[PDB]
Design a binder for these strands. Structure first.
Ligand SMILES: [Zn+2]
Ligand SMILES: [Zn+2]
Ligand SMILES: [Zn+2]
Lengths: 179, 49, 89, 56, 115, 30, 146, 65, 56
DNA sequence: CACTCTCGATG
RNA sequence: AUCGAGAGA
């Protein structure tokens, strides 16, 4: 159960309106351009293509300019993963390249043959965020019952039994290694 | 994504109403937002209509 | 037979529900309650029955639509404290 | 009494009619907002006040 | 605004001034690409916008049961079959002007009587 | 006939079709 | 109000106009940054008359403000007030022109007196936030209640 | 439980009229009102006393102990 | 409610109850009045709590 | 930060 | 007696 947050720094009036993200047990927040370049999408525009699904929308792109200004330092994949790894010698890349598979958006895939999925999805989140920031769509209703779940006997007993059975198979592992 | 979503939505809805798709599965077609969200998630509170 | 459908709130967002089946039809009683005529046409669903918005405890309340809501709440609370046959055995 | 209920109903009626008029006015972009608040807030204030006056 | 990109890098190109000829040139800082500017307009900040008002208007909008239908006549093809909605721009200070979409010629026309 | 539209009283026949199959504690059992 | 003028609401309106805060951002439709090389001849055909009348060393980069005609009536202030406010704010390092109120386009033109293009933006930023046209700060709104 | 022997409010005996009531409902196929009338239950307290009663003992007898 | 069309600012849509307790409330009116009453109970418990602290 | 009865599993 | 839960005003 991981929680990804995409933060928009700089309120209405500030000039440093950059967009960063929070990755699982990684020290500091990472600029979104660095994330996209770490996923394989290196040049600009293509990132904006992954974010802004309408080239006519000049406002959204205008809002995306300082993000490009932010991630202008990193211009390739290797140094992007190197950046994330520096946060968290080449081992760090393999650390980084792991976080983008096992920890960064696990609900789509935890495999290794999927990078465009998480990239497009991240771009979708950016799109929603900016749509909310441009006053085109208001804040999400956190009291909406449709976006809530009721765990009954099933799921509860499922969690509990997963715990107890994992403890059991662990104990059995111990009795096994005892022999 | 998916172009011509109306046919897809009518097909899905027909499948659910026939039984081929589990009646508890929710299918939300957002026209103006151009999205199609299908939830097979458990714990969703629904009601007959 | 596709006569009834299961709808959660999320899908409920995208539909138009008729309150009563008499809202599909194209000098009055002053006693009866005032009901706004259907200004909506494109119905996709109709309520089985509005009284199904209530739970088990509030379904015991006679004429809850003639009460102040906190009284319905209070009655809903006190219904679980009434005596009587809880089980035959 | 009957006539009293009729007057009540017609009162709520003219109230809803007033709200309808204000709504149609606001939608026609002719609703001039009160100083220090939104056109929408002015509309809300007017409607709420009308319905309250109706109940009273 | 509508800015462009490089033909080789596809990276965003930043504006730069040609001094000796007094003209605007978009240059790329990833390679060496420099093109001429199409418009002198470089930056635009819009505090009061109209973009987003008529948003969400798709051809399938006629099949949205949640949308109300008025008795208005389309100013174009004179069809009384239409679907309206308030400004989709979720802002605290928007007008309550109605936006109508004709279900015959897909024409967008408002109820605004001032503009 | 049998193609006529439902009234409002025939609704409780459908509600009776419900509960007769589902019961009152359906979510628990399911 | 003053012990003298009590029933004179016409003065109360003046006091309200002198107390209620008013920022430049609160009356601005939009802002643009053009590249206008020749100061005495603007690319935009709408600002030709403006530079024609303001005739009777600079920067090629132009900062062009477009104001709200209806908002100028609500706050009850002229183009001269705004222009002279900006002028008094930036003094000598900002050449400022504007169109009279009688025109149908309330426009303000500003020029600075390498890397200059992304240096004017900050300026316009400070022109939107840190600028008080009239009234007192914090005083967000004022209502005449009798 | 079982049909109350006497009416709470007034005191009229009604415990001898339950079977007769059931018969009047099933044998003569009468409605509850007329059945209650023929049993001499004019006051609506006794009328209630029989009409409102639920004979739960008939289910209680389904157990063997 | 899913029984109304979108952008419906009419009185009956935003929770106006024309009917009286004698006449009986419609489903929509019932639910809206239930929302109001709910807010009532909530801020009642909140009130007795915060007052309970203030007094101490 | 804001008096009771009670139940029912725990040391 | 020590911790959670229901409920009374
Ligand atoms: Zn390039
Ligand atoms: Zn038309
Ligand atoms: Zn009696």
């Amino acid at each position: 159960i991981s929680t990804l947050q995409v933060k928009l720094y700089g309120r209405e009036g500030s000039s440093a309106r950059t967009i960063k993200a929070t990755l699982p047990y990684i020290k500091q927040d990472i600029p979104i351009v660095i994330i996209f370049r770490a996923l394989g999408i290196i040049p600009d525009g293509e990132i904006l293509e992954h974010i802004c699904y309408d080239v006519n929308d000049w406002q959204m792109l205008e809002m995306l300019k300082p993000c490009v200004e932010d991630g202008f330092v990193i211009q390739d994949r290797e140094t992007a993963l190197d950046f994330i790894g520096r946060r968290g010698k080449e081992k760090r890349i393999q650390y980084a390249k792991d976080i983008l598979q096992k920890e960064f958006l696990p609900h789509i895939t935890q495999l290794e043959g999927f990078e465009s999925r998480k990239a497009f999805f991240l771009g979708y989140m950016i799109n929603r965020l900016l749509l909310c920031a441009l006053d085109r769509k208001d804040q999400d209703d956190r009291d909406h019952f449709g976006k809530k779940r009721l765990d009954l006997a099933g799921p509860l007993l499922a969690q509990l039994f997963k715990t107890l059975f994992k403890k059991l198979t662990k104990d059995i592992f111990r009795y096994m290694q005892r022999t | 994504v998916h172009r011509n979503p109306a046919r897809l939505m009518e097909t899905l809805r027909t499948l659910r109403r026939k039984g081929d798709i589990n009646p508890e599965v929710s299918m939300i077609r957002d026209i103006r937002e151009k999205e199609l969200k299908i939830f097979t998630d458990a714990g969703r509170v629904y009601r007959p209509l | 037979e596709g006569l009834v459908e299961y709808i959660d709130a999320e899908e409920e967002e995208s539909i138009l529900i008729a309150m009563q089946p008499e809202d599909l039809e194209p000098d009055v009683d002053p006693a009866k309650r005032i009901r706004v005529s259907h200004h909506a046409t494109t119905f996709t669903h109709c309520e089985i029955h509005p009284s199904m918005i209530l739970g088990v405890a509030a379904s015991i309340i006679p004429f809850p639509d003639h009460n102040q809501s906190p009284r319905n709440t209070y009655q809903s609370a006190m219904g679980k404290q009434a005596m009587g046959v809880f089980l035959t055995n | 009494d009957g006539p009293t209920m009729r007057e009540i109903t017609e009162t709520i009626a003219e109230a809803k009619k007033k709200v309808l008029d204000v709504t149609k006015e606001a939608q026609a972009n002719l609703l001039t907002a009160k100083h220090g608040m939104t056109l929408r807030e002015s509309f809300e204030d007017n409607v709420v006040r009308f319905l309250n006056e109706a109940r009273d | 605004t509508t800015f462009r990109f490089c033909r080789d890098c596809n990276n965003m190109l930043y504006p730069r001034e040609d001094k000796e000829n007094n003209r605007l040139l978009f240059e790329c800082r990833t390679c060496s690409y420099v093109e001429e500017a199409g418009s002198p307009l470089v930056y635009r900040h819009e505090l009061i916008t109209n973009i987003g008002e008529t948003a969400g208007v798709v051809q399938d909008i006629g099949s949205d049961p949640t949308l109300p239908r008025s008795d208005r006549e389309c100013p174009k093809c004179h069809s009384r079959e239409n679907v309206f909605f308030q400004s989709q721009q979720r802002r605290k200070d928007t007008s309550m002007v109605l936006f109508f979409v004709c279900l015959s010629c897909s024409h967008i026309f408002t109820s605004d009587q001032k503009n | 006939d049998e193609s006529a539209p439902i009234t409002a009283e025939d609704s409780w026949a459908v509600i009776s079709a419900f509960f007769r199959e589902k019961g009152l504690v359906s979510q628990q059992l399911d | 109000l003053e012990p003298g003028h009590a029933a004179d609401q016409e003065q109360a309106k003046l006091i309200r106009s002198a107390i209620e805060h008013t920022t430049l951002k609160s009356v601005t439709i939009a802002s643009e940054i053009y590249y206008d090389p020749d100061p005495r001849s603007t690319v935009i055909p709408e600002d030709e008359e403006i530079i024609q009348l303001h005739f009777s060393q600079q920067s090629p980069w132009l900062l062009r403000l477009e104001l709200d005609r209806a908002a100028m009536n609500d706050k009850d202030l002229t183009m001269g007030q705004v222009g002279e406010r900006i002028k008094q704010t930036f003094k000598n390092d900002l050449f400022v022109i504007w169109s009279e109120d009688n025109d149908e386009k309330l426009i303000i033109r500003c020029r600075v007196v390498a890397e200059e293009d992304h240096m004017l933006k900050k300026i316009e930023n400070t022109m939107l936030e840190n600028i008080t046209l009239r009234g007192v700060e914090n005083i967000e709104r004022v209502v005449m209640m009798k | 439980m079982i049909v109350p022997v006497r009416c709470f409010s007034c005191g009229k005996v009604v415990g001898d009229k339950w079977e007769s009531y059931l018969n009047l409902l099933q044998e003569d196929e009468l409605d509850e009102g007329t059945a209650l009338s023929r049993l001499g239950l004019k006051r609506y307290c006794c009328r209630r006393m029989i009409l409102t009663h639920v004979d739960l003992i008939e289910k209680f007898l389904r157990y063997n102990p | 409610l899913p029984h109304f069309s979108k952008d419906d600012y009419s009185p009956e849509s935003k929770g106006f109850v024309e009917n009286s307790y004698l006449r009986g409330l419609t489903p929509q009116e019932f639910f809206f009045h239930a929302m109001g009453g709910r807010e009532g109970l909530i801020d009642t418990a909140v009130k007795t709590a915060e007052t309970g602290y203030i007094q101490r």
